[PDB]
Structure formats: structure tokens, C-alpha cells
Amino acid sequence: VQMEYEKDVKVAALDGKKIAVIGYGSQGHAHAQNLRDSGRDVIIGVRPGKSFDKAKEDGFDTYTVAEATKLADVIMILAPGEIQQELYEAEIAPNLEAGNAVGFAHGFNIHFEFIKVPADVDVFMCAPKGPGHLVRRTYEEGFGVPALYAVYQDATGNAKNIAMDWCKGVGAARVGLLETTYKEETEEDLFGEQAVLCGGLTALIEAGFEVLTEAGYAPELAYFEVLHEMKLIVDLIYEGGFKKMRQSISNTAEYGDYVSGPRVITEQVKENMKAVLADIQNGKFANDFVNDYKAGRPKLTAYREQAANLEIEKVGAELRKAMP
Amino acid sequence: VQMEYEKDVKVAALDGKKIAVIGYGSQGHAHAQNLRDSGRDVIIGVRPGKSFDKAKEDGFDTYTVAEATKLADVIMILAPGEIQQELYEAEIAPNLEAGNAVGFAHGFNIHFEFIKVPADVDVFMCAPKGPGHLVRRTYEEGFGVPALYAVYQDATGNAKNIAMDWCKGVGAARVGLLETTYKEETEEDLFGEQAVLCGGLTALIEAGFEVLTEAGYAPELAYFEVLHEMKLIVDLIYEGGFKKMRQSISNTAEYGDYVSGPRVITEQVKENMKAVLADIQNGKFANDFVNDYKAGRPKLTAYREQAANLEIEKVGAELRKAMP
């Protein structure tokens, strides 16, 4: 795959199109405002309430989800993943007309087919790889956040042009675009957050904190040596990969990295990751998540409360207050 | 243990002391410049060469290691770990007097007794939890980098005041100090970098990248999904612990974290970490590091050349180029 920029957006396919951003959370706000600022004709579709009035206060023609869908040619759904299906069936699906384009920033619901859009309507993706506030600020400072785009179904023949022009309008084409598919975006993103970025990482930190404190070491220092110091290392990797990080640390740290990394993350861990990937590919994770939501989030409930009781989280909070 | 600040630096024990900083790398430069800006009487001891001239350029009275040691009351050794022993025996030890204080920023060589300092000389530590340029620049902008301080032997009775006044002089007391011991700093620092921050982390990322690319996914998205996106996750952990990070990510991502984290990092991984810790405590890691250095770094050589051949490093370098 080759990375793409503003020069590669061949068609300004959003020209003359009535655009509805569904949701006015952090992400919806960033998308709609960025596009407005770029030149596009943006309205907002929300439940009446906090976000609604803030959208009107922000200067947007705001409506319900249904009427904003009726008025729109392009409808980007930026509600929370867990309410997209219900919101789509109730408010969006009855108001779609052939030749509309329906966008998402995450492939989960379309890929796993919890939502199915009629085959005379385009489904596209623009997935900026950053949080809404950063997508807005980097644009509010004319560069942006790199993004993935994809098309799930192309009824009109313009779906890829709409997705790239969306990524142009929100600033992402300034820094870089990667083409993907709904399936690859969904599965690589679920795997990355589960196996490395969020699950693996937090579990790796927690396991190291437990080894130290169970061996009798001071928890405040352990907090520094498994968590606080991580930011520096990750910043170095972000800017220059393993190579830049391993150049900047001491030779003693570097050698311990090469020697002990493979003793901690073994072949068995790589196997465990494969079983994590398999459950993403075969739909079992997606079903577990959606089932938990439908049951009233009982697993998420237990998880969140156990996590609030962790020693590292209490020690960490105190130390963060002590260091303004 | 509780966090201490400038207020807790009871005595200004560096007052009237001639201070030698041994080494003029980034760490030496930071420590010496901050202390001189703090108004301490700082000379540089380093072998003739560019460092010798860069120090003389920066306005420091600059001598050989042996000659600087002879002039100084307080001698802070900031040469690289691997040469401190030879450097100390040849150049430093002959020029120490009773009531001098010798400083380190890392306890490795004192804790494992590669270096033994006469019993009428203080041995202390001030260990900023950041790299030199950061220790320098934060000082210039009016705050600093947190630090650990410790004392290994206190001959004069002023060792601890000297360590805290050093941390105050380099800016660390602006942010927070933590008292530790030479044994705990050494063993927790070695374990943190090996099990979590450096070794664990890079092996985790690499195992994830391999699982994705061996399963057939595009290497460039995998880079984003196991590496590039980690900066945001870790910044959130740095600012507000797991709690803030888990609030900030999607519920799908957060759910996957709770569910897959413990599948990847198992009890067996925690057992692997315990064996890592044990080889730190029993001195085997230390001896293997020093033996590799004595034999001409042959293991480190192989490791470094293998690291340079990693697909994730080749694909990351291209993408980091494509995203300036």
C-alpha cells in the first residue's frame, strides 16, 4: 500500500453535496467544523439536548437524526458504536434515498453486519487516526491527523471519491491517507487495541507492577519504573522507531532490552495473540461485545470496578497530584 | 515513601564545595550547566577530545578526569556505565581525599560492587527520571525533571544533604524527589526497562506486528495499529492512569482491553518476569552485561544488527519519512 495526499484526491466529490454529520460528540464536532471550514455545506443530526443546542450555538443548521438524513446526500455516522445500529434502523434507514453515501469512522458495525445499508447507497469510511479534539486542533492549525479510508459498497461509482474528499475536507489528506478495507480496518484495529496498545500494554504494566510490589519493592518507585517512564520510551519509538529509542537509553538498558524482552514475550505469548486474532476474525469477540451490551454491560461493569481498585491506580493518582 | 520538593532540601550542602562533573555527554552537560546556572562552582573532568573542547567552549574550567578529581570536593561520575570501573580505578580513586563525596546517576556499579569507594568518602545518587537534554531544557524553562536520590555510604554525615542539594541544583526538587536506596534504584530500574518499558514493550509490539503480517494484513496499517497509535494511549496513561485512557477510547476498544489483555499477558508471563527479576537480584544479568562488554560486545553487536533487519523498522522508517 502506498500513502496518499491532497494531490491524490482526484475528484472533489463533495462539491454541491448536502452533508449531514450524525452526532456532535468530540468526533462529530471535529469532522463537521473541519469540513465547514474547508468549504463544504454541513448540517448536524442529533437528539435534542446538550449537543443539539451546542450545534445550533456553533452555527450549524441542526435537526433531528431523521430530518437531517432526509435533507442529506452524504451522511457520516459519528454516534457511539454501541448505539449506531439502533439509531440507524430507527432514524437513518427510513430516510435514505438511492445514491446517498453513508460514512463511518469505524468499520465494526458494517463489517460484522450489525448494520446493513441498501445496495443503492454508498458506504464509505474515513478513519482519522486520532481523537476528535486533535482532529479539530491540527486542522485549526492547517495540518491534520493521518487517516484510513475505505469503501464497503459502491452503488454510484463515486464512493471512493467521496471518501477521499471527506479525508481532504477534514485535514487528513494534508499529512497522509492509507487505503484499506472495512474488513482490514476493523480486524487490525480490534487486534491492535486488544493485543498491544490497550490490553497487552495495560496488562504488561500491571504484571510488572505486581512483580515488583509482590517482591517487596516500594510501589511509588515501581510506578515510575513501569508506567511514568513509559512516555519517554514511547515518544522515542513514535519519532524514530526501536532504533532511536535504543540509541537514547543507556547501553545497560539497551542490552537488558534485547536480552529480557524475548524472555517475557515468548512464542507462547505470540500464540496467545493468535487466539485473540482468531476470535476477532471469526466474529466471537464482536458477538461477546454486543451480547454484553444487550445484557446491560455486566462484564464491563465488573471490569471497570475491579480496575478502579488496582493498587497501581491509587498510587498513580496520588503521585500525579504530587507532580502538578 | 513521600515526595519531597525544594522546601525539603534542609541544608545547602553543596555550599562552598568545588564540584567536578565527570563526563560531558548529555547527562554531564545537563547536570553541570544546571548546577552552574544554580550558582555552584562546577569544573568538568573528561579526557582530551571534542567533549574536552566543547566544555571549554561552554565556559567551564575543564581538566583531565584525574586532575578534576583532585581539585573537587564533590565528584559526580556521569561517564557511560561500561567504562566507569576502569575510569574510576585509573583516574578517580588515586585523587580522592577523606570527606570527598562521589556521586552517580545510576547505582549499577556501586550496587554490584564493580566499584568500591573508600569508607571515608561519601557515595550518593541523584537520578533524574529523564534524559540529559530534558534535564537541561526543563531547568531553563523554570521547572525540571523528577529524580531519585540515595546514599550508599555516609562517611561525613552530610551525604544525604549533598544528594538532595544536588537534586535541587539540577532542577529536580522543583518537580519532586523520591528517596530510595542504591539496591532498589538499581534493581527496579533494571527490571522496569527489561520487563516492561524497553524489552517487554518492544517485544510486545513486535509480536503483534508479526501476528498481523504473518496473517496477511498490510504491513503499513499494522505499523499504525501496534506502534504509531501507542503514543496517544501512553500519553493518556501518563496523565491520568489506566482510568483516563479507558475513558478516552471507544467502548469497543475498552472492552477488548479488559477481555484480551489477560489472554495475552498470562500468569506464565508474570512468571517469566519473575525469572527476569531473579537474574537481576542474583547478579547474573549484571555479570552477563559486563562479560559481553569485556569480550568486545559480541552479543550486543548481533542484537543491534538483528534489530536493524526487522520488517517493522524498515516499514516504520518509510512511513515516518512519508509523514514529516
Take residue A86 and report the three cell numbers written for it: 439502533
CA distance linking residue A256 with residue B193, whole number of Å:
7
Tell me which of B148, B165, B180 is where a domain ends.
B180
Number of domains composing chain A: 2
Count of C-beta atoms within a 10 Å radius of residue A119: 11
The amino acid occupying position A62 is T
CA count, 13 A, side-chain hemisphere, A13: 24
Both B229 and B249 in one domain: the answer is yes
A226, A150, A137, A217: which is closest to A182 by C-alpha? A150
B180 touches chain A (CB under 8 A): yes
Q: Give A44-74 as a 3 state SS string.
A: EECCCCHHHHHHHHHCCEEECHHHHHHHCCE
Cβ separation B218–A310 shorter than 8 A: no
Both A81 and A202 in one domain: the answer is no
B150 touches chain A (CB under 8 A): no
> What are the chain B neighbours of A144 within 8 Å (beta carbons)?
none
Looking only at the bridges linking them, the beta strands covering A177-179 and A147-153 are parallel
Gyration radius (Cα) of chain A, Å: 22
Tell me which of B131, B164, B180 is where a domain ends.
B180
Both B114 and B224 in one domain: the answer is no
CA distance linking residue B109 with residue A8, whole number of Å:
57
In a mutational test of the B interface, the residue from A259, A271, A285, A306 whose CB has the highest number of chain B CBs within 10 Å is: A259
CA distance linking residue A286 with residue A301, whole number of Å:
18
Q: Which of B31, B106, B111, B228 is catalytic?
A: B106
Cβ separation B221–A256 shorter than 8 A: no
Count of C-beta atoms within a 10 Å radius of residue A59: 11
Q: What is the dihedral of CA A280, A76, A128, A272, to 10 degrees?
A: -10
Query: How far is the first Cα of chain A from the last one, in angstroms, to the nearest whole number?
Result: 43
Query: How far is residue B36 from each of residues A84, B23, B30, B58, B172, measured CA to CA in Å?
Result: 61, 15, 10, 11, 15
Both B251 and B316 in one domain: the answer is yes
Residues 6+ apart with CB under 8 A from B76: B19, B20, B21, B22, B31, B102, B103, B104, B105, B126, B166
Distance from CA of A278 to the nearest CA of B (A): 10
Resolution (angstroms) equals 2.3
Looking only at the bridges linking them, the beta strands covering B41-45 and B18-22 are parallel
Q: What is the dihedral of CA A311, A250, A261, A190, to 10 degrees?
A: 70
Is-contact A139 A131, C-beta < 8 A? no
CA distance linking residue B196 with residue A209, whole number of Å:
9
Take residue B214 and report the three cell numbers written for it: 504473518
CA count, 13 A, side-chain hemisphere, A245: 27
3-state percent helix, strand, coil for chain A, nearest multiple of 5: 60, 10, 25
The amino acid occupying position A104 is F
B238, B273, B253: which is closest to A303 by C-alpha? B253
Looking only at the bridges linking them, the beta strands covering B74-77 and B18-22 are parallel
The amino acid occupying position B174 is R
The amino acid occupying position A268 is Q
> What are the chain A neighbours of B300 within 8 Å (beta carbons)?
251, 254-255, 258
Q: Give chain B as a 3 state SS string.
A: CCCECHHHCCCCCCCCCEEEEECCCHHHHHHHHHHHHCCCEEEEECCCCHHHHHHHHCCCCEECHHHHHHHCCEEEECCCHHHHHHHHHHHHHHHCCCCCEEEECCCHHHHCCCCCCCCCCEEEEEEECCCHHHHHHHHHCCCCCCEEEEEEECCCCCHHHHHHHHHHHCCHHHCCEEECCHHHHHHHHHHHHHHHHCHHHHHHHHHHHHHHHHCCCCHHHHHHHHHHCHHHHHHHHHHHHHHHHHHHCCHHHHHHHHHHHHHHCCHHHHHHHHHHHHHHHCCHHHHHHHHHHHCCCHHHHHHHHHHHCCHHHHHHHHHHHHCC
Count of C-beta atoms within a 10 Å radius of residue A245: 24
Both A170 and A241 in one domain: the answer is no
Q: Is B31 a catalytic residue?
A: no
Both B267 and B218 in one domain: the answer is yes
Looking only at the bridges linking them, the beta strands covering A61-63 and A147-153 are unpaired
From which experimental method does this structure derive? X-ray
Cβ separation B265–A194 shorter than 8 A: no
Is-contact B76 B103, C-beta < 8 A? yes
**Chain B residues 181-210 with CB within 8 Å of chain A:** 184-185, 187-208, 210
Both B258 and B121 in one domain: the answer is no
Nearest residue of A to residue B253, measured between CA atoms? A193
Residue whose grid cell is 574510576: B88
Task: Give just the sign of the alpha carbon dihedral A278, A284, A286, A288.
Answer: negative
Count of C-beta atoms within a 10 Å radius of residue B83: 12
CA distance linking residue B235 with residue A250, whole number of Å:
23
Looking only at the bridges linking them, the beta strands covering B122-128 and B147-153 are antiparallel
Task: Give residue B278's domain range.
Answer: 181-324
CA angle A50, A53, A55 (to 5 degrees): 105
Q: What is the dihedral of CA A46, A48, A52, A57, to 10 degrees?
A: 150
Phi-psi region of A153 (alpha: psi -120 to 50; beta: other; left: phi over 0): beta
B137 touches chain A (CB under 8 A): no
Both A165 and A186 in one domain: the answer is no
Q: What is the DSSP letter of A1?
A: -
Gyration radius (Cα) of chain B, Å: 22
Tell me how many residue pairs between chain A and chain B have CB atoms under 8 A apart. 413
CA distance linking residue B43 with residue A118, whole number of Å:
77
Is-contact B121 B72, C-beta < 8 A? no
Both A209 and A145 in one domain: the answer is no
Burial status of residue A309 (CB atoms within 10 A of its CB: 0-12, 13-18, 19 or more): exposed
- Identify any residues that bridge with B41 across adjacent strands, giving them in sequence order: B18
CA distance linking residue A83 with residue A86, whole number of Å:
5
> What are the chain A neighbours of B292 within 8 Å (beta carbons)?
255
Tell me which of A140, A162, A180 is where a domain ends.
A180
Task: Give just the sign of the alpha carbon dihedral A23, A25, A28, A33.
Answer: positive
Breaks (C-N over 2.5 A) in chain B follow: none
Take residue B243 and report the three cell numbers written for it: 482510568
Is-contact B160 B137, C-beta < 8 A? no
Nearest residue of A to residue B255, measured between CA atoms? A300
The amino acid occupying position B117 is V
Is-contact B155 B117, C-beta < 8 A? no
Residues 6+ apart with CB under 8 A from A157: none
**Chain A residues 77-106 with CB within 8 Å of chain B:** 80-82, 106
Residues 6+ apart with CB under 8 A from A42: A19, A20, A21, A32, A35, A36, A60
Query: How far is the first Cα of chain B from the last one, in angstroms, to the nearest whole number?
Result: 43
CA distance linking residue B126 with residue B167, whole number of Å:
6
Sheet holding A61-63, edge to edge: A61-63, A41-45, A18-22, A74-77, A101-104, A122-128, A147-153, A177-179
Burial status of residue A282 (CB atoms within 10 A of its CB: 0-12, 13-18, 19 or more): exposed
Cβ separation A203–B261 shorter than 8 A: yes
Both A149 and A169 in one domain: the answer is yes
Both B40 and B117 in one domain: the answer is yes
A189, A281, A150, A195: which is closest to B225 by C-alpha? A189
Both A5 and A136 in one domain: the answer is yes
In a mutational test of the A interface, the residue from B234, B235, B299, B306 whose CB has the highest number of chain A CBs within 10 Å is: B234
> What are the chain B neighbours of A312 within 8 Å (beta carbons)?
241-242
CA distance linking residue A295 with residue A281, whole number of Å:
23
B224, B255, B275 member nearest A289 (Cβ): B255
Sheet holding B122-128, edge to edge: B62-63, B41-45, B18-22, B74-77, B101-104, B122-128, B147-153, B177-179
CA distance linking residue A291 with residue A288, whole number of Å:
5
CA count, 13 A, side-chain hemisphere, A236: 19
Task: Give just the sign of the alpha carbon dihedral A273, A278, A281, A286.
Answer: negative
Q: What is the DSSP letter of A215?
A: T
> What are the chain A neighbours of B137 within 8 Å (beta carbons)?
none
Give per-residue burial for B295-320: e unless 16+ CB within 10 Å, then b. Answer: eebebbeebbeebeebebbebbeebb
Distance from CA of B207 to the nearest CA of A (A): 6
Burial status of residue A128 (CB atoms within 10 A of its CB: 0-12, 13-18, 19 or more): buried
The amino acid occupying position A161 is N
Residues 6+ apart with CB under 8 A from B281: B187
